């Protein structure tokens, strides 16, 4: 009975990934819903008294790579509560009955450590609409999930069941009834893309301006957040390729701060960068040409049919996440 | 008896509980 | 039903006016006067349409 | 053994018969089946036998577990709210011993009532499933549901199921009373809004509740509850939109108003202490915004499958 | 210049905040004092 | 460990069916290719040192009943090496993730 | 957009010139003067087209 809690104690993370609300570019409706879900019942407990109850479940859905796990990291950072990060490897067991006793002990620990947050990434693996799947695991896990979510003699009060999935239409109808907040996280718009570029570039010394970031956001038409992250990564790795595949360096302005340039200048010394020791390194600064080359190299991942499926799911049972 | 261990089979799934 | 259509219809227009203003603000954050002078306008006209 | 100390609840959740909006036939059937053998014990003897099996079904989120909570509140009897988690073990034979001792304790604690939520977790139709944990448990439940001569006085089995066509036909025939819980009608919608608002101050009238129930076309009970929750949370969002606060009348009860007024004290909202914030009142526009936000959680395929099931086993 | 453009946003915010009380009066005004000023730019 | 080896020990044939190379008519190029690829690394291993490597797989296709399994019987006869005769019933299993381990 | 078309268009030509030079080099590695004298040329003409 204690080995179950010892196995489930590895699902409570204590690393606290530093993702703040200013790190998330856009998604103001989802951020406001998560704020009124977690920040308010701990900061202002004198408002949720009587017939006013907080939210008891939020389903984040959308295209792959839009920021659902990033909002989960931001909630785990700024929640100041117990965060349960479970998956299909922490609930399914080899024996018989342990696959439901683990879920019962997980919800018992979540109710014992209230206020607590249960984050189940990829809820479509556990809830497979119980029509054709494996009888034992599917039926028992889904029914125990329903009973531990509301049930009769459980009274789940103060816990939050976060869920992030890419396939929202393959959920069970009872699970979709349990998740009382269907929040659609879409692909980012122009202002969100420009703020995401401003966040991902950071304190790197570059000649880019706000008009340059605006033209970059206008260029990335249909990109996702991971695609913006990898074109920022490619544009940041571009000065390393510039300092690798070039010769005829030149000391600019400091203990020989030498920089690659055109062959033939005021001191175009023909040597290699491997002989250059550290801290006499003046790499070329970022321009718009490196980000244009990163845009030309890296291609968008999300197609234009899954967007139609997510749009049909929003018009069927979904809200908007701005 | 002893413990009962759940296994997995293939169709074309199920739970053939082969205990010890 | 018809009184509901009326309150929701005006409530919807007000939401749209506020949206256009928020877009306008977001636009000035790039000094884009063009967009701004437009959304701040499509909005105002609509507050008169109320 | 002693592991069944969590199947019975001692909380008694305060859900009375007036809280259950609508469902008059199911309410009166559960009422007679839980009251009349305790009210008039001479009425049930021999031929005129009471109901020993009650099954509830319909769309998901219509009031099955709510009716079970109402029975557990206004029954004055031992409630056995147990599911498939406390019936299956790692060993062999203990999965039958659990059901045997469960029915033994339920017969010893007469008058009792056993509520099995999601009974399809025990009825996998034994196609190619787990033998020792499915078929033997199903036959044990079939021979322990043979209390038409054994448990004439005492226990009563219940059932709540969202998907009732995937159910074993033997236990379906053993459940003699199968009541279909439908989507609520307009009067049930209006009294459900009246119950869910409750003692919260508002300006909503009976005509406002009637047009709200007319706007909710095809909504469910949980959808009505989360619409009421969104309408309750909307004045907190209006306070969070803090601009030009204004004091009303005791000991500085502030209230935000329109930008530009008489006494528009432009300040924040977190600088003020508690118990002096006169919150705005519930209009109909926040309710209409919650209606436009929240979507119905049920589809048309489940409704036609429920219609097929009730026309096949009404 | 920058202060003038900011004073528009400051306005257009108040205007938004105002509609949250359906106060069309304030709104139609601030949304205007703002617009005129974007032309003053 | 022991179950897989006990199931796969029956695939090795030790009966050595006596079909010589003269018992097959025609097929000169296939006879030469199979003859070198089974005989030469066993007989003269000093000819394949470094840059030169023997053949690592031969497909014998054609119409049904042309002597493909008879040629395989000839290779199994005059191979003087271990012969594994597997089929669909020895590799495919009922459990999940058992055929790949086999 | 048009200034972008201009910088990208010239950047594209420069990439092509460098590609042709790399192909030319690769060609001499077989003493193939023919290919070389050609690619080194298609390239040069293009640097004048800049
Ligand atoms: N909306 C966003 N705001 C900020 N960063 C983002 C956003 N979307 C993606 N990213 C970046 O790209 C990564 C991919 O997003 P991630 O949280 O892994 O999405 P998912 O939930 O699909 O796994 C993030 O970790 C972050 O570095
Ligand atoms: N008849 C009803 N009266 C009042 N509220 C109801 C009714 N039916 C449904 N609801 C609302 O919807 C919820 C659904 O009932 P609940 O017992 O939680 O689950 P279920 O109906 O799926 O068994 C109730 O908790 C309540 O909030
Ligand atoms: N070239 C050949 N020399 C001798 N026998 C042959 C020849 N071709 C076919 N056969 C005979 O025909 C039969 C078919 O052999 P097999 O290779 O099993 O056909 P397949 O594999 O196409 O079913 C064998 O029994 C063999 O004796
Ligand atoms: F890939 Be993410 F989880 F949408
Ligand atoms: F209909 Be409920 F989800 F039991
Ligand atoms: Mg994710
Ligand atoms: Mg229920
Ligand atoms: Mg053959």
Author numbering:
A (entry chain B): 112 to 364, 369 to 437
B (entry chain G): 1 to 12, 18 to 25
C (entry chain I), G (entry chain K): 281 to 330
D (entry chain A): 116 to 364, 369 to 433
E (entry chain H): 290 to 330
F (entry chain D): 112 to 213
What do the authors of the reporting publication say about this deposited model?
The large and diverse family of AAA+ ATPases (ATPases Associated with various Activities) includes multiple members that form hexamers and are believed to unfold protein substrates by translocating them through their central pore. Here, we show that the mechanism proposed for linear, extended polypeptides is also compatible with translocation of more complex substrates. Structure determination showed that a primary segment of the circular peptide binds indistinguishably from the isolated linear peptide, while a secondary segment packs against it in a β-ladder hairpin configuration that passes through the hexamer pore without distorting the Vps4 structure or making intimate contacts with Vps4. These observations indicate that AAA+ ATPases can translocate two chains of a substrate, such as would occur in crosslinked chains or in ubiquitin conjugates, using the same mechanism as for an extended polypeptide.
The Vta1VSL domains dimerize in an antiparallel orientation through formation of a four-helix bundle. Each dimer binds to adjacent Vps4 subunits, yielding a stoichiometry of 12 Vta1 subunits (six dimers) to 6 Vps4 subunits. The Vta1VSL density is clearer than our earlier reconstructions with the extended Vps2 peptide, presumably because of its 10-fold higher concentration in the current study and consequently higher occupancy in the particles imaged. Moreover, the Vta1VSL density is better for the cFF30 structure compared to the cF30 dataset, presumably because the use of Spotiton to prepare cFF30 grids reduced the time to vitrification, which reduced the contacts with the air-water interface that cause complex dissolution and preferred orientation. In a substantial increase over our previous reconstructions using conventional blotting methods, ~17% of the particles derived from Spotiton grids contribute density to all six Vta1VSL sites on the Vps4 hexamer. Reconstruction of these particles yielded an overall resolution of 4.4 Å. Distinct densities at each Vps4 subunit interface allowed unambiguous assignment of all four helices in the Vta1 dimers, although their location at the periphery of the Vps4 complex remains a region of relatively low local resolution (~5–8 Å). This supports the conclusion that Vps4 and Vta1 associate with 6:12 stoichiometry in the fully assembled complex.
